[PDB]
Amino acid sequence: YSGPKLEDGKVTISFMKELMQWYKDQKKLHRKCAYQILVQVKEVLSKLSTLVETTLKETEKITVCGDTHGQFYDLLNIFELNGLPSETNPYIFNGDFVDRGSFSVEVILTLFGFKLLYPDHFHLLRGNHETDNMNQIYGFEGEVKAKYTAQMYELFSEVFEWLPLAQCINGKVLIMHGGLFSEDGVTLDDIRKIERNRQPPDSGPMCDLLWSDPQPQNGRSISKRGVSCQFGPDVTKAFLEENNLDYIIRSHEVKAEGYEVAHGGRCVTVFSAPNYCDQMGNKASYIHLQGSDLRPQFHQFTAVPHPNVKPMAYA
Ligand SMILES: C[C@]1(C(=O)O)[C@@H]2CC[C@@H](O2)[C@@]1(C)C(=O)O
Numbered sequence: 001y002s003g004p005k006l007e008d009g010k011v012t013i014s015f016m017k018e019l020m021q022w023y024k025d026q027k028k029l030h031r032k033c034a035y036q037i038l039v040q041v042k043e044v045l046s047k048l049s050t051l052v053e054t055t056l057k058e059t060e061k062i063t064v065c066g067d068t069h070g071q072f073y074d075l076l077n078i079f080e081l082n083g084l085p086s087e088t089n090p091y092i093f094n095g096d097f098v099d100r101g102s103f104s105v106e107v108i109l110t111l112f113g114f115k116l117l118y119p120d121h122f123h124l125l126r127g128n129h130e131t132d133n134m135n136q137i138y139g140f141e142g143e144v145k146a147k148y149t150a151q152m153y154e155l156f157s158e159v160f161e162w163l164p165l166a167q168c169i170n171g172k173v174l175i176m177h178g179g180l181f182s183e184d185g186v187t188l189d190d191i192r193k194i195e196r197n198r199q200p201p202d203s204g205p206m207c208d209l210l211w212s213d214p215q216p217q218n219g220r221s222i223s224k225r226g227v228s229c230q231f232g233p234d235v236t237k238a239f240l241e242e243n244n245l246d247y248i249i250r251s252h253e254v255k256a257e258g259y260e261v262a263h264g265g266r267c268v269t270v271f272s273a274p275n276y277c278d279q280m281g282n283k284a285s286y287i288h289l290q291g292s293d294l295r296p297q298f299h300q301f302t303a304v305p306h307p308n309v310k311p312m313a314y315a
């Protein structure tokens, strides 16, 4: 084995650079190194609140990306366009790192590596795909079994359970993969108190955070997905008012231009998987936010070439 190795059992920037190249070239991280990253990131994640609360000073910025779905080559492209993560270039990836795309193992170990390297500046929130039900069906379990073992997959599942569910920046912008709630009256403190180390329930706020979608019309609707609800602009306004927030950023739906701003400015979607599943033809975006100005700035990008593996090849 001549690939990337941890230094004194820990991730370093030189290791991350070697890993990205190893992966670009379609090579596999030694099972022992993958194991070490999984055990170490589980420890880090298990210490975090369900609601990560981050302060951005007025000179600081942060980049928010939505779903990536195993599109490793597009992930590399985000880092080339926007710079590598660092203490001065923080990232939030908003769920759905795996499944559908056929380089899910490469995406997740790269993201985990950076979480380890910059724990206070590199943020991962759970998506509806960081769950067992979903992985068993949509490729990630298949991909892990092919590249490693069922045992490695079980370890991934355990780590996913520790991913936080939401992140609030400056007490003003709340970020979650899915969206808001099937019931009124949910508070930031309620989110902080969610016992999140589990597979999500079929209902309730942990389910909603991972699964809900905005709708244009006032009210709530039963979701077409068969889980959670669609929520209207009235739901969003009431939630922001109670919680003294300005707006929410969420992901979880493909958008032709990579983003959408709904509810009169209150509910932003960001989606970071361009030409989703080699078929959608959509643009992707990431968002920049600055401490001095938390309004969202959208940066669009398009798909780049990848090796000839079809989406869902391991599904
Ligand atoms: C279909 C998607 C998925 O399966 O995760 C994929 C495409 C849009 C968004 O990401 C989606 C709807 C989601 O629910 O996360």
Ligand SMILES: [Zn+2]
Pocket: 067, 069, 096, 129, 252, 253
């Ligand atoms: Zn998704």
Ligand SMILES: [Zn+2]
Pocket: 067, 096, 127, 128, 129, 177, 210, 251, 252, 253
């Ligand atoms: Zn989703």
